[PDB]
C-alpha cells in the first residue's frame, strides 16, 4: 500500500450532464453522512460597479425565504433534520451546500433547488439584510488580514472587475434595489453554469434523480491586467503592521501551478511574527506571493528575507528543498481532501474550474514531474524581475518604498 498505490483506492467522481446543462457530480463512499451542494460560476468579477454587492446580498437573503416555504419554515426544516446549511461567495464562485445525513439526501437536494430556482426576495427582508450588511462592514473593518487582501486585489487589478471586493461599497449595497438582484439572478443563476456536487453516503443515480426532479427547471438558455501598483494605509495606532506582496500568477488552467505550489511550500518566521505564502488562482490571472505581520521596527528585515528566499528559489534551488516541498504539497493535498465537506467543495470547484475532477493520481504524477530545474525555471518565469503589487495596512513607515521593493526583485550578483 504505497502512496501511489493508495491513491488508486480513491473512488472516482461520477459526472452526468442534464438536459438543461446542470452538471451533477458525486463521489460515493461508505460514509453515514453527506454534504450536497450547488456551485455556481458567478462571483464579484462578473459584477459591474452598478451591482458590485449583488452576490453577497443574495447570499445573505438566500436562506431568508423562498416561494414554496417562508424563511422561518426553511430554517426550521433545515434544523429539524439536524443538517447545517452554509454558503460562501468568492470573486469567481458562489456555493450553497447542505451538510446532512445520507438518508436525508432526498430532502436536502430539494432544498437546494428551492434556494436556487425560486428565491423569495421579500422587501422587508431586503431592508433587514441591508442593515445586517451595513453592520457587517464595521465588523469586517476589524479584520486586518481581510482588509490587506482587499487592498492587494484592488491595487493589483485596478481597472478590472477582478479588483472590486465581494461585499462591495457601502453606497452600492445601500442603493442596491430588488430589481437589480432579480436581474442578477436571471442573468447569472442559470445552467449549465451550475454543478450539483455531493460526496459521502450518496449513490450517484439517486443524486441524478433528485437533480432532475428539483434542479431540472432551471432555464436551459474585459482583459484582466495585473498592474504592479501599491496601496499604503497607515493608521499608526494599530499594534502590528500587515503586509501582502504578490506578483501575477497563472490562471487555473496552467501546468505551472504545481511548481508554484512546491515553491511556496519551500518558502524563517523568526524575523517575522506570522508569515504565510499564498497562491490565489483565478481563471486567467492570479496572485502568487506572501503575507506577513510585522513589528513596527522590523518590516524591512522581513521583506528582505522574503525577497531573498524568492531570489534563492529563482536562481539556485537545490534538489533536497524541492523534494521537501513536493512532500509537503502531497501531504497538504491529501490531508485537505479528508472530510466530506472538503471533497464536495473540491468536486464543485474543480468542475467549475478545470471542467473535470482531476484525480489524485494525476496530481501525484504532476508533482513527480516537478524538479529543481523546473522550480528554478518557473520561479524565474513568474517571480524574478517582476513588478509586484504591494498592500500595507499600517503602521507602515519602515516598509521599503516601491522602488526599493521592485529593486529587491532581482539580484545584481546573478
Amino acid at each position: 500500500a504505497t502512496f501511489a498505490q493508495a491513491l488508486q483506492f480513491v473512488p472516482e467522481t461520477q459526472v452526468s450532464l442534464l438536459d438543461n446543462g446542470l452538471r451533477v457530480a458525486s463521489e460515493q463512499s461508505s460514509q453515514p453522512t453527506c454534504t450536497v451542494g450547488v456551485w455556481i460560476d458567478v462571483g464579484s468579477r462578473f459584477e459591474t460597479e452598478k451591482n458590485n454587492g449583488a452576490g453577497y446580498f443574495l447570499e445573505h437573503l438566500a436562506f431568508k425565504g423562498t416561494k414554496n416555504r417562508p424563511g422561518s419554515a426553511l430554517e426550521k426544516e433545515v434544523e429539524s433534520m439536524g443538517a447545517h446549511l452554509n454558503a460562501y461567495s468568492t470573486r469567481e464562485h458562489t456555493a450553497y451546500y447542505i451538510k446532512a445525513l445520507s438518508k436525508d439526501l432526498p430532502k436536502a437536494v430539494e432544498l437546494l433547488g428551492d434556494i436556487v430556482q425560486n428565491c423569495s426576495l421579500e422587501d422587508s427582508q431586503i431592508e433587514k439584510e441591508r442593515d445586517v450588511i451595513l453592520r457587517e462592514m464595521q465588523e469586517n473593518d476589524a479584520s486586518m488580514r481581510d482588509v490587506v487582501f482587499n487592498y492587494l486585489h484592488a491595487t493589483a487589478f485596478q481597472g478590472t472587475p477582478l479588483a472590486q471586493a465581494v461585499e462591495g461599497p457601502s453606497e452600492n449595497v445601500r442603493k442596491l434595489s430588488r430589481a437589480d438582484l432579480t436581474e442578477y439572478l436571471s442573468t447569472h443563476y442559470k445552467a449549465p453554469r451550475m454543478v450539483l456536487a455531493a460526496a459521502g453516503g450518496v449513490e450517484h443515480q439517486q443524486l441524478l434523480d433528485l437533480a432532475q426532479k428539483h434542479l431540472g427547471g432551471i432555464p436551459w438558455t474585459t482583459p484582466c491586467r495585473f498592474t504592479g501598483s501599491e496601496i499604503r494605509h497607515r493608521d499608526d495606532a494599530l499594534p502590528f503592521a500587515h503586509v501582502a506582496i504578490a506578483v501575477e500568477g497563472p490562471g487555473w488552467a496552467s501546468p505551472d501551478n504545481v511548481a508554484l505550489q512546491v515553491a511556496n511550500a519551500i518558502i524563517a518566521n523568526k524575523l517575522c511574527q506570522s508569515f504565510q505564502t499564498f497562491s490565489i488562482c483565478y481563471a486567467e490571472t492570479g496572485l502568487l506571493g506572501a503575507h506577513f505581520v510585522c513589528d513596527r521596527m522590523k518590516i524591512d528585515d522581513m521583506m528582505f528575507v522574503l525577497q531573498g528566499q524568492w531570489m534563492r528559489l529563482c536562481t539556485s534551488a537545490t534538489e533536497s528543498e524541492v523534494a521537501r516541498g513536493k512532500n509537503i504539497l502531497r501531504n497538504a493535498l491529501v490531508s485537505h481532501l479528508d472530510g466530506t465537506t472538503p471533497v464536495c467543495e473540491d468536486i464543485g470547484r474543480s468542475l467549475l474550474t478545470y471542467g473535470r475532477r482531476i484525480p489524485l493520481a494525476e496530481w501525484e504524477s504532476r508533482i513527480a514531474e516537478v524538479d529543481a530545474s523546473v522550480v528554478r525555471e518557473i520561479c524565474s518565469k513568474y517571480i524574478y524581475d517582476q513588478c509586484p503589487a504591494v498592500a500595507g495596512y499600517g503602521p507602515i513607515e519602515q516598509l521599503p518604498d516601491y522602488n526599493r521593493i521592485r529593486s529587491g526583485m532581482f539580484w545584481l550578483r546573478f
Binding site: 499604503r232 497607515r234 513607515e397 521592485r406
Partner: protein
Amino acid sequence: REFGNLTRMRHVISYSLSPFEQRAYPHVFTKGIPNVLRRIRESFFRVVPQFVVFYLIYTWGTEEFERSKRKNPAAYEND
C-alpha cells in the same frame, strides 16, 4: 532616527504606481508646459525687478564712467 519611529500619522492612505507601468513624461503639453509657465509667472514679478534695477545701475555707471574721461572742452578753450 530610523524610518520605523519618526512620527505618528493616522489613516493616511496613498496609492502609487510602478515606474515601469507609467510613463516618464506624462502631460508634457497638457499640464507640464502650463505648470512651468505659471511657476515662471509667479516668480517673475518677485525676482526680475531687482535685476532690472541692477542692469539700469550697471548701464548708467558705465556710461557715466565713459563720459567722465571724454570731457574738458572749456578747460582748454580758455587758452
